[PDB]
Design a protein around this ligand. Sequence first.
Ligand SMILES: CCCCCCCCCCCCCCCCCC(=O)OC[C@H](COP(=O)([O-])OCC(O)COP(=O)([O-])OC[C@@H](COC(=O)CCCCCCCCCCCCCCCCC)OC(=O)CCCCCCCCCCCCCCCCC)OC(=O)CCCCCCCCCCCCCCCCC
Ligand SMILES: CCCCCCCCCCCCCCCCCC(=O)OC[C@H](COP(=O)([O-])OCC(O)COP(=O)([O-])OC[C@@H](COC(=O)CCCCCCCCCCCCCCCCC)OC(=O)CCCCCCCCCCCCCCCCC)OC(=O)CCCCCCCCCCCCCCCCC
Ligand SMILES: CCCCCCCCCCCCCCCCCC(=O)OC[C@H](COP(=O)([O-])OCC(O)COP(=O)([O-])OC[C@@H](COC(=O)CCCCCCCCCCCCCCCCC)OC(=O)CCCCCCCCCCCCCCCCC)OC(=O)CCCCCCCCCCCCCCCCC
Ligand SMILES: CCCCCCCCCCCCCCCCCC(=O)O[C@@H](COC(=O)CCCCCCCCCCCCCCC)COP(=O)(O)OCC[N+](C)(C)C
Ligand SMILES: CCCCCCCCCCCCCCCCCCCC(=O)O[C@H](COC(=O)CCCCCCCCCCCCCC)COP(=O)(O)OCCN
Lengths: 205, 187, 250, 82, 161, 80, 47, 42, 226, 308
Amino acid sequence: TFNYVIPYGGSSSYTINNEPVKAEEVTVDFSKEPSASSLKLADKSDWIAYTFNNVPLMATVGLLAGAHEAFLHYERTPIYGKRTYNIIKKLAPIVINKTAYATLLGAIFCATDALYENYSGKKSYTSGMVAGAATGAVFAIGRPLPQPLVWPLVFAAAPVIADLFGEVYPESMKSARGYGTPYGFENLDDAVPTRNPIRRNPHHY
Amino acid sequence: AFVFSTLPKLSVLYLISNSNIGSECVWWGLISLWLGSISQYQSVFVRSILLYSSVAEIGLVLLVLQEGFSWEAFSWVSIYFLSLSGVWHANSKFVSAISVASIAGLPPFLGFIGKAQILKSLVSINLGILIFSSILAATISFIGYLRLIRLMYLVSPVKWKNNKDSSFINWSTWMLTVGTLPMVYSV
Amino acid sequence: VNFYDAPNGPAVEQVKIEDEWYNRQRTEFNILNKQPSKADDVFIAPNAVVCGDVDLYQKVSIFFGAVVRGDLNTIRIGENSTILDKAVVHAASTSPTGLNAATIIGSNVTVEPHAVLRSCRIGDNCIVGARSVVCEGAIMHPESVLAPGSVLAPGRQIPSGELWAGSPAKFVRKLTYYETSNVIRESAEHYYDIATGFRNETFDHGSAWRDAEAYRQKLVDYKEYNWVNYREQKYVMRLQRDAAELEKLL
Amino acid sequence: DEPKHQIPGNALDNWAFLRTYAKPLPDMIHYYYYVYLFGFFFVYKVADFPEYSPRVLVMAALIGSLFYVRRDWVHREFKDSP
Amino acid sequence: DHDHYTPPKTVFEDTITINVLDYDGKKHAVKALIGTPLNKALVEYGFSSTYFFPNMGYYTQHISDAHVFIPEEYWKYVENVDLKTDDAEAIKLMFKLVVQDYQRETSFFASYLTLNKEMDNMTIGFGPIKPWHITPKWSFNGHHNVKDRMFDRLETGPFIE
Amino acid sequence: GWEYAGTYGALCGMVYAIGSNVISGRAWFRRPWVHVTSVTLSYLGSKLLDEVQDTYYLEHLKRVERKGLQVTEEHKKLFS
Amino acid sequence: VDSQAEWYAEYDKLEKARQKRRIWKWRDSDSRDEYAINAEEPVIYIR
Amino acid sequence: SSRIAGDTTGKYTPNIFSPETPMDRSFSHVPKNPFWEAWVFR
Amino acid sequence: ASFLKTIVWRCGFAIKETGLALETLGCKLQGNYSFREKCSRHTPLTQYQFKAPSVGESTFVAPSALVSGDVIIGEKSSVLYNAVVRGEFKSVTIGEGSTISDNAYVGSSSEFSPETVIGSNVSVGSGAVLKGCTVGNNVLIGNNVIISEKATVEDNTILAPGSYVPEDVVVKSGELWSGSPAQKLRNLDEKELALFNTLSVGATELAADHAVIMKLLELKQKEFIK
Amino acid sequence: SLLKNYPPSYLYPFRHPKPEGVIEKVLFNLGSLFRSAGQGMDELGSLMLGNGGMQESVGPNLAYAPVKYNPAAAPKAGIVAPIPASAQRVLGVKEIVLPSKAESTFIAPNANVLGDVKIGAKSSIWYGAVLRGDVNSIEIGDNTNVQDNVTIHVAKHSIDGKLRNTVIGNNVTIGHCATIHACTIADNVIIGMGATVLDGVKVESGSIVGAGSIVPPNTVIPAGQVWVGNPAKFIRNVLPEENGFIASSANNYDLLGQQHKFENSKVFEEMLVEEEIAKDRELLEDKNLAVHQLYIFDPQTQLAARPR
Ligand SMILES: CCCCCCCCCCCCCCCCCC(=O)OC[C@H](COP(=O)([O-])OCC(O)COP(=O)([O-])OC[C@@H](COC(=O)CCCCCCCCCCCCCCCCC)OC(=O)CCCCCCCCCCCCCCCCC)OC(=O)CCCCCCCCCCCCCCCCC
Ligand SMILES: CCCCCCCCCCCCCCCCCC(=O)OC[C@H](COP(=O)([O-])OCC(O)COP(=O)([O-])OC[C@@H](COC(=O)CCCCCCCCCCCCCCCCC)OC(=O)CCCCCCCCCCCCCCCCC)OC(=O)CCCCCCCCCCCCCCCCC
Ligand SMILES: CCCCCCCCCCCCCCCCCC(=O)OC[C@H](COP(=O)([O-])OCC(O)COP(=O)([O-])OC[C@@H](COC(=O)CCCCCCCCCCCCCCCCC)OC(=O)CCCCCCCCCCCCCCCCC)OC(=O)CCCCCCCCCCCCCCCCC
Ligand SMILES: CCCCCCCCCCCCCCCCCC(=O)O[C@@H](COC(=O)CCCCCCCCCCCCCCC)COP(=O)(O)OCC[N+](C)(C)C
Ligand SMILES: CCCCCCCCCCCCCCCCCCCC(=O)O[C@H](COC(=O)CCCCCCCCCCCCCC)COP(=O)(O)OCCN
């Protein structure tokens, strides 16, 4: 409007609908659909199955962290001097404990997420928040004062961030095209494509 | 360090774009973006700041190039070359400041156009995680570039060697300032 | 006479002062191994003489008649410091105090006309008055002013924020906040503006060479000009000296 | 004289704590070799990994960030003992 | 009001000499002014550029530091540093990269000690330093055989060689 | 394409001459020859850039028409 | 000063620029290997 | 002990070497307090 | 106006700079590198932009002396060797019969310096620093006398060698002043008052002899050049 | 030198030898055209610049400068020399007194030494020093250094017959910016920087005059005394070590004078050649250049000495 007399923006009729018009005459899709593996892992029906399918990721991350710390300890120890102690006995707890703690935290998160979703019966943000909060509570069992408040918050926030930018964002902005005519405005006289642009072939790596 | 951190990249980007060498995985560019930004912020030495900036940016550029945006990577590499030339061949504080600003992506300089091409490409693919990471990592990188600006004009008197060999350096600084308006069509 | 171990070599041909028909004084010249260093915006007046290991920082102005001799030791002039007319800056080989004998001049220091500074430390934002002598080992602390016609005896110190005057310099008054913050810096900026003005009207190679060239051309036309390979003559001279020194028995 | 921030701790105790970083420093090549090797094998393996939910991925990234130990931390605390 | 003015002391009165043991083992008498940091006093005397290293702090690289051994009696005059700040990060980095094993309980950095009247005739020694690198221009190979002076280096600090 | 490329280029050449003088510590008016050379070269380069951009715009229009984008006469007018 | 003409001219210029941009944004893959998407293009390969 | 720095006629000069303190803008500054300054810092 | 003169100066300077550059290029093409000789580029009467030193016909200005900016020198006056007369910032005026001795500085180059006025029959001693001051007629300045800005020396006065005249101090007529803070010593005797003219005429005679010798030096230089 | 095939342009940078090639001849003629057009443009610009036209000329050599010979008062310190016939038929001066200097003496080009000035061997007149012997003779002894901006003056003896010549003894140091009138200085004296010695003052041997001190007229400073102040007054007697300092200072300034004489005396062609030597020293600092593998260069003159 760019005036001071009437409200800015506009209004669209709710009664009047515009019949959908295809973006192009022929649509070629270079985006592959989700794999059967993805759907299997995503299935939260059985909490135990869901947990056991998704823990490998947490275990791997714990193993990488433990390997990192163990290597740092091993690198410093001197080869030239003989050591009374056994290095593996010193280093094995590091890796084992890190992997176990990571797996336990990821198990708690996955279990609570599946159990809440089943009990509630709906896929919602709350399920992620309560799983994160429970994981952060387990993380901060014996930590000083600030940490009990901070970790349940950071952990609860992480599934919120994942849901907003991993699931809601793409579905929200699926229609936008970028070529031909703007999604909403097809009356405007813009070049109309016979086929959609294919910027890349479907990936295979 | 300057010639081998810029020139080699063009060949690899051309190979990737022309030979369809792209993967569905976004972990490597996301990692490069975050690691580079955090390491740039925690680095005391100025050479490490400049080296980690290239890691972060080339991670983002890798993510953009996998999705088919060849034109934007070829324009980015040229702007990045011109931006890096004046910071690396440091002789004048002003030339170095304009270079750091262009690498940072400030709008009056050509560096803004180069970063804009990548960011514009990112919004087309519509991946939320990449956009969020990009914004936060860019802020962290900006703090490192502000550190560089602080070191030159706000910390202590600065005396540098009089290496008066600015072959293309004056031209590069001019091309950075002036080039924004001609290349505005791209973005 | 002839220094044979000089960095650039011995002098093949040396002209006597009696034979010179024109003034050939150079504003910046190297004394043996010691080379003066200057920034791009340093103004050295044609009359001024700067020799030896003198480091001139950015925005340093050397006005007409000033001699900055860095033969005995190093002289460093800080940013935006102006040496005015007929002011001599010199360095002693050793100081009486026992500290470094370099003449270090800080930033925003104004050396008024005819003031002599030798082997002294002048702090930032200082003014040395006209006909003021700062002797070897005297340290002037920052934000201090020495009044015209005053002598700082060897090994003495002027504290910060104070005006000193008298032949045996003594405390006069404490400088006000405004004077220290603004007037001292402003004086250096004014003299910088004057030097910048002088620099804008100076040509890279002024048309003073033409007179010497006319003589050289006349000689060339009358075939008296000779082409001398100075580099070869320097090499030959050094070889001859080394042979002679080896031969000498005492 | 001007007001200044109070520094917690005694001067000699803080300096002693700072001096625990002055230890034989390994070369970074040893770490880099292993990271390059395992990273190459990891990239090859990653193509075959099952597709994970974004939420699980983000949680794994959080856990990895929390469990990552800075190289300086191990360096300061490393003791050659059982 | 109007109390008695205190005339300043002459340089002779306020010069303290410190005996500094160099890397080669020679003892040098370094005359110094009270109120100056040790690093500056050492730099002015005329020690080589190899004996000093830039302070490895985010914004302190212009300062040139040295590894020094301080006698137990003068530990009080060293300056306290807050661990939760970045000055501690500077000190930790210099210990990790420069001092390394050559560390001793008496090891300190020159910048954190300020010369005073009570430090007259103090004996200090340069502590051994490991090869370090920041930029190709600012580095130490490990050979103390250059005969230049740190004073003669006009460039303030490292940036880009 | 751009109808102000020549003017922009001349002004930018001025920007080069003044900037080069200022960076080196000289005043803007120094080295007058540099000013004419810079102005002419920048003007020509700006013009050349505009033709290059137009040429690649037309190449793109040809390519898109071949692919199957049903560009109208007015659209074919947009790309000079 | 015909304000109506100026407004319509400015709007037209912006609309033409938007159309040209959208036409420009229609970009297929230019990979040399990707012969399928670019079958109609006239290219010669020296290899 | 004091003198008028300002000159309305325009012939103002800073007598940096004057024994007497100029009555410049610094004359009217308020004296600070060690404890008030520390309170401000805190 | 001033803007027109500035534009005219900038145009002429640009043309002269280009001409000298083209001459240097011609020398480079010929292979002659005489342009790179660093010789004394000192000019006795330097001009800053359009402000040039006005000089009388009978005046003697030494070659080593520097008269800069708008300096009006009256007839029968002499600026001797290595004397700096700076009138760039503000104008400097020298009266009839006045002599500036060797290694003397007269100038008005401070930011707030008043216009320097020098009266008739004023002899400035060797080493005196005069900054923004008015000197009256028949005044003898000492060897190292420093006169600060805004100080006025009245007629028929002698300043003893080494005296420093602080700012806004008026030296009265018929008096002798001395000391770092100049204070009146004694009233001038009649012989000193009469001595001023003799000193001035003697200086003028010496200046004439120096001028003749300087002309001889110019003829010698001319023989080599032409 | 190892090689004799060096390009002529390299061997004679100051002036290239006469052009021999066709291309070189064309370049020479073009250079002549460019020089003439440039001088024309220079003159046109000088017209716009106005009065003076910013013209520059070579300055006279005032280090060894003549003074008008007085038939009445014969020269005492300097020699008298005839002036070229043409100048005689124009100027009319039969003879001119010229300074007298020993071979070892160093006189700065900036310095102005005029008329009746006798300078001893190993003495140095530094930059900006004006020594005027127009009216009376000035005598400087051996190993005496007149520093920067010093003015030495004389007067006429007058009816009284008071001697108004300036005699400076051997091993005397006159500090920077000092002004000396018609005074006598004995041997081994240091005059401080800024000190003004007025007429009639006798400074005895071994004394030191302090910096910025005005010694009142007709004052005899006794031997081995230090006098400082605006009205110079005795403060203390010279220490035994300070006599050694005096001698050391004189000897050091003698060595300094020799070094400065050496640097200043080189001819322009040599100075240019040395500038090229220095530039090539800077370029050749890098030791990974291909030319370094071919030969080892002489350090003082960067000419190939031996193969590598
Ligand atoms: C004079 C006419 C010029 C007008 C047009 C030019 C075309 C005709 C060439 C005529 C020569 C003029 C040179 C101008 C352009 C250079 C191109 C070129 O030359 O080849 C192109 C031309 C054909 O290729 P093409 O036109 O590009 O089209 C091919 C396909 O379309 C596939 O190619 P494509 O990549 O172009 O595909 C279209 C592309 C769309 O691509 C484009 O839209 C390009 C946009 C143009 C940007 C221009 C900047 C590029 C920088 C290069 C500067 C030119 C350097 C000159 C080098 C050669 C010198 C002759 O779509 C894409 O998505 C691909 C991405 C492309 C890269 C992204 C563009 C961004 C570039 C970076 C910009 C960032 C800004 C940085 C700074 C900016 C500040 C203002 O080749 C030839 O005609 C023959 C080459 C012969 C050259 C030398 C031979 C002559 C001498 C022989 C012996 C030499 C020895 C003796 C020496 C003699 C002298 C001593
Ligand atoms: C047997 C050999 C030993 C190695 C074992 C394995 C060998 C490698 C095999 C395969 C390697 C490929 C994959 C490994 C990770 C990729 C990184 C890499 O390889 O670079 C080379 C790297 C060395 O490179 P460098 O350039 O020499 O070192 C640069 C640093 O400055 C180094 O200097 P620095 O360590 O002294 O400084 C560390 C600095 C460096 O900074 C970083 O680490 C940046 C990384 C940040 C995230 C990285 C991207 C995350 C995206 C992951 C993508 C997958 C998920 C997809 C979606 C997730 C969306 C984000 O970070 C820190 O300051 C410590 C904090 C840790 C992260 C900071 C973020 C905290 C956020 C948490 C918020 C909670 C606080 C709230 C309360 C606060 C109160 C106010 O080598 C390794 O570190 C490998 C060790 C493997 C341990 C990784 C632990 C988990 C791995 C996956 C989790 C993903 C997060 C990454 C966390 C830490 C990774 C460094
Ligand atoms: C914008 C959007 C972005 C998109 C795309 C952007 C585009 C990208 C690329 C664009 C690049 C732009 C930025 C780069 C700029 C290039 C760099 C640059 O500016 O120059 C660098 C370079 C830097 O010079 P430098 O800073 O002094 O350092 C070099 C050292 O001297 C080192 O010394 P050296 O040993 O190396 O000496 C070699 C060289 C360097 O030597 C020199 O530079 C010494 C000075 C040369 C002599 C003075 C020039 C004479 C006339 C110039 C006119 C100035 C007018 C001002 C005052 C008016 C006077 C009446 O000598 C030369 O000049 C070679 C050229 C041959 C011409 C020489 C003159 C010939 C006689 C005059 C020709 C015609 C007379 C007509 C009228 C005459 C008077 C108006 O400048 C030049 O080399 C000058 C080149 C040509 C000289 C002027 C010739 C103009 C023709 C006369 C005017 C007639 C109207 C012109 C139209 C018709 C033409 C005939
Ligand atoms: C549409 C254009 C916009 C797109 C941008 C990309 C297209 C480029 C268009 C313009 C390119 C201009 C490049 C500017 C280079 C600047 C010139 C230069 O670098 O000169 C050097 C050249 O230095 C050299 O090394 C010279 C060696 C080679 C000289 C030139 C080679 C010419 C080969 C032929 C080129 C013609 C192209 C061939 C056919 C296209 C001189 O500098 P120095 O002397 O080393 O130091 C300068 C010192 N100071 C400035 C401080 C006074
Ligand atoms: C950058 C965003 C990060 C959040 C920052 C918040 C502050 C961090 C503190 C940590 C707390 C954990 C994160 C909680 C934020 C979510 C907001 C709570 C609101 C809420 O509980 O409703 C849920 C939906 O909100 C939602 O989950 C969607 C709301 C989106 C979050 C807010 C977006 C803007 C916040 C940015 C503010 C400033 C940015 C700087 C950080 C339930 O929904 P339901 O569907 O489950 O219904 C129930 C049927 N069972």
